[model samples]
Target chain A: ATSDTQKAMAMLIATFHKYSGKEGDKLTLSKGELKELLSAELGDIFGKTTDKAALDKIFKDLDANADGSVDFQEYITLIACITMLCNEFFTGK
Target chain B: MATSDTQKAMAMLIATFHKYSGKEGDKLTLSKGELKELLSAELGDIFGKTTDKAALDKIFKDLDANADGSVDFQEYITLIACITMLCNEFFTG
Candidate 1:
């Protein structure tokens, strides 16, 4: 019953936790989890076939603190970046 | 129906903009009052009671990048990005 913006926020939280909880620390996303998330949730945008090297590169970029995992902050940062890019495209960038 | 979480989240963001932008002047952007209402209603928990007039004024200024007295979709997305990142940081601690 949340409003559109509220629902968007909720979806962000739920989507992260869904992937983050799959293995290792329930609060963060392992490299594998990130891979799965990207493959399933953003395949079309990110290319249907994300090879291991690319995945590894992406994980390294996302793990800002080099913590060996992607935390909520890092994950959402990526989303924010993508969202901005999408907005730019829509705005005829 | 959105085929994936990322798409759904993006759609929700687009939906949310219209829900607020049309309520006042300039249907393509958020007037100050519209921005205040959007934040207060959708992000009430994160901003809490401290979203006072002064805070709102500062926020409005920040979001109105062109100083056009309004927040366009691009500027509005930045607010979401900043808040989402802040929430993630809060969660990490």
Candidate 2:
């Protein structure tokens, strides 16, 4: 039986590849891809992000190692950060 | 409205943290008992081995990196990062 941990991990992997595979490198999220992902997948939470510079800042920050693309690890870090924020919202911590 | 995959994953992670963190002590942090139950239930038999108490005690300490004597959201995210890294390797290898 797959534990909740196992399923949660799978969801994270699947979510990353869904966006990462949309453009150039099948293994990373290009700037355009990341923007669409943010706008579409997280629009409810990240409003006011349609601004050009704002999106650029998020992409730049998420593209750690400064490789111009968000690799899986970097993307995972983003998710982790977002989830941590949500944890605070849900738990008031 | 169908929630996006990214949203689903984020929600799952936040929920998973709460499932254990609410058990005892602070409502936003995991005590030793809470961590053990969280790991054992969500990670399965290997971590459930009661004979390895010392190793688990060490893990609990390391996981509580802030010396706060409790595992908070940030620290739990660190742990999940490790689990996700291992999952990444499992999928790639």
Candidate 3:
């Protein structure tokens, strides 16, 4: 049987998929689509001056294969990285 | 007007909360509760086999304040750290 943490992660993944969507999925946002989605979603917090360049850099950083696109694996990797960064920032280590 | 990355981070946080809870919040899990929750949640995942000893060590390492447990802020920080590590691992130096 899967451990509790695994289940939680699965739930977390499912939750991510629910929100982020995928090809032919509920909230599927393709590469270009994600850029647009992030622009609109982040516009408020990032300020009006913020543009897609920063997002492009981040996406490119996460898109490992340099395929100019992100699949679910790529997306989750980004999420994991973000989570780790937040952890370090708060912990101060 | 936050940047797209910030917005995406916020969205990710909100999504995490919707699933994880916070006692009175959507799916609230406290200190020990969080450990248990993670145990259940991350099973079969990297942390799935992690023992309480392992988890405790990690928590203590992050607690820094000797608070003896983790709060929401602490938890968020931990998540961020996890994400960053994953990012580095996949992309390589």
Highest TM-score scorer: 2
The model with the greater lDDT, 1 or 3, is 1
Better of 1 and 2 by TM-score: 2
| lDDT of candidate 3 over B1-87, digit per residue (tens) | 223443444444544543555446424234545544543354314433233445435653554553455445335435533433342
Q: Candidate 1 chain A — worst ten consecutive residues by lDDT sum?
A: A46-55
DockQ of each: 0.39, 0.44, 0.13
DockQ of 2: 0.44
- Identify the CAPRI category of the predicted complex in candidate 2: acceptable
Off by over 4 Å in 2: A22-27, A47-67, A83-93, B45-61, B64-68, B87-90
For model 2, name the residue pairs that clash.
none
Q: Write the number of the candidate with greater TM-score, choosing between 2 and 3.
A: 2
What tens-digit string does per-residue lDDT give for candidate 2 at A1-93?
A: 776666777776777778776667666777556666666776665432334464455656645533367666666666555544433454353
> Residue B44: error of model 2 in Å?
3.4
- Model 3, A32-63: lDDT tens digits are 55444433543343322233464446656535
Alpha-carbon local distance difference test for all models: 0.62, 0.60, 0.42
Which model is ahead, 1 or 2, in terms of DockQ?
Answer: 2
Clash number for model 2? 0
Provide the lDDT at A40 for model 3: 51
What would the TM-scores of all predictions be? 0.58, 0.65, 0.32
